[PDB]
Design a binder for this molecule. Structure first.
Ligand SMILES: Nc1ncnc2c1ncn2[C@H]1C[C@H](O)[C@@H](COP(=O)(O)OP(=O)(O)OP(=O)(O)O)O1
Length: 309
C-alpha cells in the first residue's frame, strides 16, 4: 500500500470501536494524555500519584499491590485508607494474616477507631464478607491483606484457591463498578493471583531499593513502585519515594524530588531553594523545612498538580 492520510482516520475508528466494545482503556498510546476522573484516592506520594496518571487510585476498581516481604505494600495500602477516611469515607480491612499494627496505622493518619476490621475463618468467607460490605454501598475502600493467605474451606478441613479467586472476583467485580468502592488486594511473592492479574484494573509492583540512611542507622527505605498494569492511564510508569520507619510515606520528600524534577525547586549544591527563599541545605533539612511549614509545602504540591494534572 501507499496510504498515509486516510490511515490516521481508519485507525481512529478502530480504536473508537475497541473502546466502546471493551471499555475505555482497552487500547492506548503510552504517550497519551490520561483521562481525568472526578474522584481518586491519593496515595500520599505525589510521585506515585502521577505515575498512576489520574492523581491517585481509581474508584470502583480492583487494585493489586504485589511485591516481596516488607516492601511497602501494606504501607501504601494503609495510606490509601488514611486518605479515603480523611474525606469522610469509611474503610474495611479483611485480615487473614493478623499482622496489622494500629499504632503504626494511626501514625499514618488512619482513623483506627472507625476502621472496620474483619478476620475470617476461611478464604471464601473473606471474599463473601468483602462482597457483602461492598454491596452495602457504604464502603469507600476495602483492603484485603494477603491473597496468599485466603485458604479455601476444603484445604482447611488441587487449584482450589485459583477457582476461588476467579469466582469471587467475577461477582465482586460488578458490585464495585456500581458502588464506586475500590478494593486493594495485597499479594506476596502465583496461587490465586493468576486471575487477580486479569480482573485488576491497576497492578503495582513495590520493591525495596535502598535502605535510606543518614549518619546514624537506616531511618527509612527508598521504595520503587512500578505500575505494570493501568487501565485508567498509560501503564509501565514507575515512581520512587521514602518510607520512614514509624512514619510511613514521606509526603514532603516527594514534594522535593518531584519539585526539582519540574523546575519548581532549585538545587545549588546541597542547597534546596524555592522561588526565592531557601528550604534548606540537604534533603533532610529541606524535608524538615516543609514538614513544619505546611503552608508552603501545600503550595509546592498544588503547583505540581497545576503543571501536570
Ligand atoms: N509497626 C511498624 N513500625 C515501624 N515501621 C514499620 C511498621 N510496620 C511496618 N514498618 C516499616 C518497616 C519496613 O521497612 C516497612 C514495610 O512496609 P510494609 O508496608 O509493612 O511492607 P509489606 O506490607 O509489603 O511487607 P510485610 O510482609 O512485612 O507485611 O515499613
Amino acid at each position: 500500500m501507499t496510504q498515509t492520510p486516510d490511515r490516521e482516520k481508519a485507525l481512529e475508528l478502530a480504536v473508537a470501536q475497541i473502546e466502546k466494545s471493551y471499555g475505555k482503556g482497552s487500547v492506548m498510546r503510552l504517550g497519551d494524555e490520561a483521562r481525568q476522573p472526578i474522584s481518586v484516592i491519593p496515595t500520599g506520594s505525589i510521585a506515585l500519584d502521577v505515575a498512576l496518571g489520574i492523581g491517585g487510585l481509581p474508584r470502583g476498581r480492583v487494585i493489586e499491590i504485589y511485591g516481596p516481604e516488607s516492601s511497602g505494600k501494606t504501607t501504601v495500602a494503609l495510606h490509601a485508607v488514611a486518605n479515603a477516611q480523611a474525606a469522610g469515607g469509611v474503610a474495611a480491612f479483611i485480615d487473614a494474616e493478623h499482622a496489622l499494627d494500629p499504632d503504626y496505622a494511626k501514625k499514618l493518619g488512619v482513623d483506627t477507631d472507625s476502621l472496620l476490621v474483619s478476620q475470617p475463618d476461611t478464604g471464601e468467607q473473606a471474599l463473601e464478607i468483602a462482597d457483602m460490605l461492598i454491596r452495602s454501598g457504604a464502603l469507600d475502600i476495602v483492603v484485603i491483606d494477603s491473597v496468599a493467605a485466603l485458604v479455601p474451606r476444603a484445604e482447611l478441613e488441587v487449584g482450589l484457591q485459583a477457582r476461588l479467586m476467579s469466582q469471587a472476583l467475577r461477582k465482586m467485580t460488578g458490585a464495585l463498578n456500581n458502588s464506586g468502592t475500590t478494593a486493594i488486594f495485597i499479594n506476596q511473592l502465583t496461587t490465586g493471583g493468576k486471575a487477580l492479574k486479569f480482573y485488576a484494573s491497576v497492578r503495582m509492583d513495590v520493591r525495596r531499593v535502598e535502605t535510606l540512611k543518614d549518619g546514624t542507622n537506616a531511618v527509612g527505605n527508598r521504595t520503587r513502585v512500578k505500575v505494570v498494569k493501568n487501565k485508567c492511564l498509560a501503564p509501565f510508569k514507575q515512581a520512587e519515594f521514602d518510607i520512614l520507619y514509624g512514619k510511613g510515606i514521606s509526603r514532603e520528600g516527594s514534594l522535593i524530588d518531584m519539585g526539582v524534577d519540574q523546575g519548581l525547586i532549585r538545587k545549588s549544591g546541597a542547597w534546596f531553594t524555592y522561588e526565592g527563599e531557601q528550604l534548606g541545605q540537604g534533603k533532610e533539612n529541606a524535608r524538615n523545612f516543609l514538614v513544619e511549614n505546611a503552608d508552603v509545602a501545600d503550595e509546592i504540591e498544588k503547583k505540581i498538580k497545576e503543571k501536570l494534572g
